[PDB]
Amino acid sequence: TSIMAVTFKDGVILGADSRTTTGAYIANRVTDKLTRVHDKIWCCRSGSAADTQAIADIVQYHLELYTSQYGTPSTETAASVFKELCYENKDNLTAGIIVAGYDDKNKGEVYTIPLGGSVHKLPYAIAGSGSTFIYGYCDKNFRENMSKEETVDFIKHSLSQAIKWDGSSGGVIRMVVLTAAGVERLIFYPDEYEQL
């Protein structure tokens, strides 16, 4: 699984591959690893499909009930609810989750939650088995306040390499753009990103 969230000038973009594996067999080659917990708060899932789906479903419930009572929650609040579940159930869970969201006050924000249940606020974040092969590339090529077109290119090129080297990653590159303008879904097929 290769997934990343990057913050740019107009907001944040989430990227992921589409491969689910049972050993060396690809169970699903069109998986959606980008999941909505709120209109403008999404997450990237790495680890157990069952654990990450269960966690996301509970967070979506918690933020729906939060919205009914206290209005739109902050990206920081969403990350805190994810952390609470991951930290308090660390012994029984295998979940690495990147939380990405757009406020108007705070703009684009990215929070990463590794296995322990710790929280780390970052300008961008990478995770999953595929991420190991692109630490070098991402660190050398990431700039703050990139354009939408630059940030789509950065993610596309990064996940292209992660997919190339990791057997656990593959299929299509899915992306979700979070800006003031709204929510845009993007897809990039093998014939496009393999020739980069």
Binding site: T20, A27, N28, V30, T31, D32, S48, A49, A50, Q53, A54
Partner: peptide
Amino acid sequence: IHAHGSTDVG
């Protein structure tokens, strides 16, 4: 739906 509780669409 897999025994551990993961779901897939297709």
